[PDB]
Design a protein around this ligand. Structure first.
Ligand SMILES: NC(=O)c1ccc[n+]([C@@H]2O[C@H](COP(=O)([O-])OP(=O)(O)OC[C@H]3O[C@@H](n4cnc5c(N)ncnc54)[C@H](O)[C@@H]3O)[C@@H](O)[C@H]2O)c1
Ligand SMILES: [Mg+2]
Ligand SMILES: [Mg+2]
Ligand SMILES: [Mg+2]
Ligand SMILES: [Mg+2]
Lengths: 48, 168, 142, 139, 119, 153
RNA sequence: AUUUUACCAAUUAAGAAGAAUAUUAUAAUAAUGGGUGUCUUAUAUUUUAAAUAAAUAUUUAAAUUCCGUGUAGUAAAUUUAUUAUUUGUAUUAUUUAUAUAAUAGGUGUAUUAUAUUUAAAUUUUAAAUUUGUUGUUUUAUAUUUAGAUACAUAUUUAUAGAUUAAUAUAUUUAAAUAAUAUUUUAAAAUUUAUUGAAAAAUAAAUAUAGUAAGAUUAUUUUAGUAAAUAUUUAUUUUUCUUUGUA
RNA sequence: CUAUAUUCUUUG
C-alpha cells in the first residue's frame, strides 16, 4: 500500500533519507526555470 | 427576520462566497512583481524540516540554534554559496577597466570585493556600482511563462585594463 | 445544468429531502365541532343543527323555533367541498376511499399494525387514547 | 488603492489572500506573576539568610502552566487567581472552528475528548487488538 | 434516527436487510464479485467497528474490554460461574457444524451403495 | 420467498436520507426472478434447493386450503409434527441441524429457573389471586407468599 | 456588324490526435485554518459564553387564539454513518463539444396581380388578447439548439360498524391498506449581515402578481347543449309515432 | 364570535 499518492514526485535519496529533500526540491525548481540541456527556443519571447 | 426563510429544505454545506477569493499565488511574472510579506504555516514547517528533522529528530538546545555553529550558519560560513558570474562581452577582446558581474542580490558591495580578493585573488578594485535587475522572463513554445532568477549587476572598476582574448 | 459552466463548477447550495405534511392535516376541527357524519357505506350525510338561535328567541313562534333542534344534512356542495379536503391524501389512487371525520378504530390501529411498528411496544393496540398508567407511588417529574 | 487596472492592484487582490501564521497567545498576567510566588510562604534560614528548601513545599504546590515557561510551582492558597490560564492550557490551541469537524459526525464524538474544549483522540484499539481481544473470549 | 438496527443481522444470508439502491440489471463477471465483496465487507466493517468502539469505550471506563468489572473478575478466580445463561462459544458452534457434516458424508457413502445395489 | 419490506421513512421523517422513497429493504440481486429466468434458458436446480423450497413453502400451501379440507390434514398424516414427537424428526439443512442441536444442547440450562421457556407458568393451577383494595392491584399468592412481581415504573 | 435580348436557380457527408487521467451523482476509515517563485523576528500571530444546528428526528388520537400546530425508548456503546484518488479508467450509472465549405451561366416571364408548366380560376401573416366577440394592443429577421412532473394498473394465507351531547346502546348486509406530488417566467417590495458618504453599493432568500402580463412540447379525431359544462357511471317502466332523463 | 342566562325556556 502506497505511503504517498501515485502522482507525487519522488524527492529523496536512494537510501530513503529525507535529509536533503529541500536541496533536491530547490534544484529541481531552478532546473524547471532554466533547464541546462535546453536547445534553441522557437518562441518570439526569448530571454535575450 | 420579519419572515423566516425556508432553511429546512437545504442540507448543510457552506456555499462558496460570491465575491470568490482568488488563489494566493502570484501569477504576474513581469517587472512589477511583489514579494508577499505574509507568512504561512508551510514556511516555518519547511524551515523546521530543513534545519533539523522536525517530524522525527528531537530539537537541539536553543543555545545551539542561536549560535554560529548551528548547521545552516556553519555550512554558510565554511561552504559559501554564491554565483558570481561575469558577462563576457565586457571582458572579451576589448580592453576594459570595468568588467561586469552578475551577482546574487543578497551580496553587498563589500562582499563582492571580499569574494574577488580571497577567491579570485583580484586585489585591485577601486569600487563597485550596483544595479538590481529582475530576472529574465521568457515564454517557451507552449507559452509557459518562466522567469530566470533575479540578479545584481555589478560594474567593477579596476586599476589595470583587462581583456580576455579570442583566438579567431 | 453543460460542461462549460462557471455557475455549476462553483458549489452553492444543495437541496435536501423535503418533509411531508401531517397525514390528517385537512380534517380541521371546526368541522368536527359543528357536524357529524352519519351513514351506511357509500352514502353518508354530514349533519348539523341550525343556527337562528341565540340572538332573538322571543316573539317569533314555537314551531319556527323548534325547527332548529333537528339534525339536518348539509347541502351537497358544502359536503363535497369539505370532503374534497379529505380526498387530497391520495390522488390517482382510485381504489381508495376518503378519510372520515373522526378516526375509526381501524384508522387508529393502522398506524401501529404495520410491519415497521411491530417492535414498538409503545403505541401498540392504542395507547394515547387510554388513560395513563398509575405512576410509581414515589413518581415525580421535577 | 486596490482598485485599478495596474498590476500592483492586481497583486494586492491575490497576495493578500494567503493566511498568516497563527499561534494561540494566551493572555499575560502582568499583575499576578506566577514566577514570583516561589518566594512566597518560605521560612528563612538565619545564618545564610537564604530560603529554607522545604520538602513539603513541592507537594502542596500547584503547577501553573504558561507558554514561555513549562510550568510554575505556586502555593495552593494562591492558585485561585490563575483559574483562567488553567482553562487556556487545557483548551485546544486553535479557533474551535478549525477543529469543529470532530464534533459533527458521530464516530468522532465517541472517540474524541471534549472536556473544556480539548479536542484530542481518546485511546482507541487497533483492529488486530480488537480481533485478538474478542477471540480469546471465544466470541 | 430509527433505521431499524435490530433487523441488521436478522436475515438468513449476508446480503439481506441491506439497502442496496446502487445496482444494475446485468451484473458482469467482476461486478458480481464486487457485489459479494461489498456485502460481506458491509457486515464485517459494521461488526468490527462495533467491536472496537465498545472495547475502546470499556477500556476508557477503566474496566475489562468485555465490560466485565472487578467483581466478575473475582468470581472467575474463585471458580464461580459468572453469568446466568452460558451461551455457546465460537469453538462450540464450529464443532456442531463439523459433526453434522461428518454425519452427512458417511450417509452419502451408504446411499451410494444402496442406489448402486438397486440400479 | 422474500422478507417483508419495511419503510422507516414512510412519511418524510428522516431528511438526511439519501436513498429512494419506498421500501428500504429491496430484494437482493442473487435471488430467483422473472428477468433472469427469461434471460437464461436452462434452469439447473440442485435437489438441496428442491428440498428447501418445499420446506419453506409447506405451511404456506397448507394455510391456503379451504377449512373443510385443512381439517383432514391431520387425519391423512400431513401435519405430523416432530416437536410433539409423533414421528421421528425430518431432514433439514446443515445449518438448521446445527441450530437444532444447539438448542438440544442448551435446553438443559433452563430447568431450575422459573423463566424456563420450555415450561413457562407451571404454577397456575395451584395459584391463588388476591385483589388489593388500597391501590388497585391483583397480586398472586402461593402458600401465603407473594409470588407476583410488581413492575418497575 | 463593334454585340449571341432583358429576366429567371439551388443548397452542400467533414480534410485530419482539434474533445478524455472529461461532466454529474455514487467511497460512511483522513482532516488544527492548502499555497509552490519557499526561508530570523513575534512587545506586534488570543475567540471564548447552558438556546435550532455545518450535530438536520419511523403513524392518522387527545388537547390548545375553534379555522396551518401536532406521535411519544427500540433495544440500554448495536450494526444510519458526514464518506473521497486508487489495491480495478475506484466501482455503478449519467452526460458530452458549431475550427474547416469551388457545387450548376439558365424550365415557366417579357405590357403588373401572387406555386403546381393547357395558359385560367383562387387566395387578408400567424399566436395571445378581447365575451358590443373587432377596425384596437403585445411577440416573432432567419438557421441550429436549450426550454416547463397530479402514478390512466392492485391474483390464493386475511380479518373491515353503526349510533348518543354524554353515560350508554346493539334489530341490522361491502371493501383492491395506501400516503411522499401538485404548471412556468417576472415586479414595485421586504428582512438579514457588511462597506462607504455627510438613502447608496456588495452579499443572501424561490414574498406576492384571475384587471397588469406572457408562455405551457406529441395531426389524421367518433355522441349533444344554484343553473350550466366536464370526467366516470346508471334506468330496457307501457300509448300512433317520437324524446340525453339520471 | 365572546360574555350573561344551566331542565323542556332565555339576552346582547
Ligand atoms: N413494560 C415493561 O416493563 C415490560 C415490557 C416487556 C417485558 N417486560 C418484562 O417484565 C419483566 C420485569 O420487568 P421490570 O421492568 O419490572 O424489570 P426490568 O426488566 O426493568 O429489570 C429486570 C432486571 O432483571 C433482568 N432480567 C430480565 N429478564 C431476565 C431473565 N429472564 N433472567 C434473568 N434476568 C432477567 C433485567 O435485565 C434486569 O437486570 C421482565 O421479563 C421484563 O422483560 C416488562
Ligand atoms: Mg474520522
Ligand atoms: Mg471536431
Ligand atoms: Mg417586434
Ligand atoms: Mg430542441
Amino acid at each position: 500500500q502506497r505511503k504517498l499518492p501515485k502522482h507525487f514526485p519522488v524527492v529523496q535519496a536512494s537510501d530513503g533519507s529525507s535529509l536533503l529533500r529541500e536541496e533536491t526540491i530547490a534544484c529541481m525548481e531552478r532546473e524547471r526555470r532554466l533547464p541546462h540541456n535546453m536547445g534553441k527556443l522557437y518562441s518570439y519571447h526569448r530571454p535575450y | 427576520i420579519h419572515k423566516g426563510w425556508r432553511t429546512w429544505e437545504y442540507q448543510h454545506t457552506r456555499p462558496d462566497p460570491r465575491p470568490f477569493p482568488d488563489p494566493p499565488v502570484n501569477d504576474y511574472f513581469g517587472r512589477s512583481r511583489i514579494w508577499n510579506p505574509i507568512a504561512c504555516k508551510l514556511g516555518y514547517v519547511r524551515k523546521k524540516a530543513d534545519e533539523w528533522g522536525w517530524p522525527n529528530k528531537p530539537p537541539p538546545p536553543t543555545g545551539l540554534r542561536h549560535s554560529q555553529e548551528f548547521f545552516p550558519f556553519f555550512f554558510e560560513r565554511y561552504f559559501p554559496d554564491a554565483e558570481v558570474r561575469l558577462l563576457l562581452d565586457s571582458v572579451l577582446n576589448n580592453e576594459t577597466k570595468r568588467p561586469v558581474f552578475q551577482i546574487p542580490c543578497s551580496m553587498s558591495k563589500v562582499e563582492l570585493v571580499n569574494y574577488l580578493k580571497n577567491i579570485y585573488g583580484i586585489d585591485n578594485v577601486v569600487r563597485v556600482e550596483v544595479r538590481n535587475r529582475r530576472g529574465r522572463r521568457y515564454k517557451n513554445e507552449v507559452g509557459e511563462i518562466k522567469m530566470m532568477d533575479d540578479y545584481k549587476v555589478a560594474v567593477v572598476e579596476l586599476d589595470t585594463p583587462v581583456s580576455v582574448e579570442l583566438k579567431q | 445544468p453543460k460542461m462549460g459552466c462557471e455557475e455549476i463548477t462553483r458549489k452553492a447550495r444543495r437541496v435536501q429531502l423535503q418533509p411531508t405534511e401531517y397525514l390528517a392535516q385537512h380534517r380541521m376541527q371546526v368541522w368536527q365541532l359543528r357536524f357529524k357524519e352519519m351513514g351506511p357505506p357509500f352514502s353518508r350525510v354530514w349533519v348539523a343543527l341550525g343556527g337562528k338561535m341565540r340572538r332573538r328567541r322571543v316573539g317569533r313562534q314555537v314551531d319556527v323555533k323548534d325547527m332548529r333542534y333537528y339534525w339536518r344534512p348539509i347541502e351537497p356542495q358544502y359536503q363535497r367541498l369539505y370532503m374534497s379536503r379529505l380526498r387530497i391524501r391520495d390522488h390517482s389512487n382510485k381504489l381508495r376511499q376518503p378519510m372520515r371525520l373522526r378516526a375509526t378504530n381501524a384508522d387508529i390501529g393502522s398506524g401501529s399494525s404495520s410491519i415497521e411498528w411491530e417492535r414498538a411496544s409503545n403505541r401498540k393496540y392504542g395507547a394515547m387514547l387510554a388513560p395513563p398508567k398509575r405512576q410509581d407511588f414515589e413518581f415525580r417529574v421535577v | 488603492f486596490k482598485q485599478g487596472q495596474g498590476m500592483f492592484s492586481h497583486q494586492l487582490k491575490r497576495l493578500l489572500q494567503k493566511k498568516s501564521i497563527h499561534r494561540y497567545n494566551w493572555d499575560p498576567l502582568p499583575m499576578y506573576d506566577p514566577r514570583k510566588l516561589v518566594h512566597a510562604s518560605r521560612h528563612m534560614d538565619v545564618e545564610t539568610w537564604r530560603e529554607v528548601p522545604d520538602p513539603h513545599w513541592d507537594e502542596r504546590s500547584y503547577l501553573v502552566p504558561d507558554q514561555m515557561f513549562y510550568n510554575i510551582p505556586v502555593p495552593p492558597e494562591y492558585k485561585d487567581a490563575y483559574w483562567w490560564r488553567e482553562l487556556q492550557a487545557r483548551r485546544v490551541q486553535c479557533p474551535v472552528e478549525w477543529v469543529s469537524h470532530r464534533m459533527y459526525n458521530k464516530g468522532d464524538r465517541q472517540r474524541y475528548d471534549f472536556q473544556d474544549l480539548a479536542f484530542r483522540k481518546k485511546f482507541e484499539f487497533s483492529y488486530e487488538e480488537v480481533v485478538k481481544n474478542a477471540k480469546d473470549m471465544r466470541s | 434516527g430509527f433505521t431499524m438496527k435490530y433487523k441488521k443481522g436478522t436475515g438468513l444470508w449476508d446480503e439481506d436487510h441491506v439497502n442496496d439502491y446502487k445496482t444494475n440489471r446485468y451484473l458482469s463477471a467482476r461486478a458480481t464479485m464486487r457485489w459479494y465483496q461489498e456485502m460481506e465487507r458491509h457486515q464485517t466493517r459494521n461488526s468490527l467497528n462495533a467491536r472496537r468502539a465498545t472495547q475502546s469505550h470499556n477500556n476508557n471506563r477503566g474496566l475489562h474490554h468485555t465490560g466485565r468489572g472487578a467483581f466478575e473478575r473475582e468470581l472467575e478466580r474463585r471458580g464461580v460461574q459468572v453469568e446466568k445463561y452460558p451461551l455457546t462459544t465460537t469453538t462450540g458452534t464450529m464443532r456442531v457444524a463439523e459433526l453434522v457434516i461428518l454425519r452427512r458424508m458417511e450417509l452419502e457413502k451408504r446411499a451410494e451403495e444402496a442406489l448402486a445395489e438397486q440400479r | 420467498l422474500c422478507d417483508e419490506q419495511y419503510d422507516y421513512n414512510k412519511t418524510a421523517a428522516k431528511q438526511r436520507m439519501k436513498g429512494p422513497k419506498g421500501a428500504k429493504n429491496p430484494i437482493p440481486i442473487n435471488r430467483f426472478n422473472a428477468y433472469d429466468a427469461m434471460k437464461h434458458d436452462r434452469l439447473v436446480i440442485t435437489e438441496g434447493a428442491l428440498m428447501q423450497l418445499e420446506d419453506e413453502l409447506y405451511e404456506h400451501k397448507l394455510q391456503i386450503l379451504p377449512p373443510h379440507i385443512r381439517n383432514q390434514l391431520p387425519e391423512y398424516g400431513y401435519l405430523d409434527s416432530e416437536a410433539l414427537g409423533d414421528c421421528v424428526p425430518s431432514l433439514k439443512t446443515i445449518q438448521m441441524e446445527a441450530a437444532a442441536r444447539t438448542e438440544e444442547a442448551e435446553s438443559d440450562m433452563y430447568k431450575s429457573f422459573i423463566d424456563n421457556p420450555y415450561n413457562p407458568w407451571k404454577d397456575n393451577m395451584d395459584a391463588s389471586y388476591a385483589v388489593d383494595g388500597a391501590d388497585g392491584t391483583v397480586q398472586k399468592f402461593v402458600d401465603g407468599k407473594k409470588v407476583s412481581w410488581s413492575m418497575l415504573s
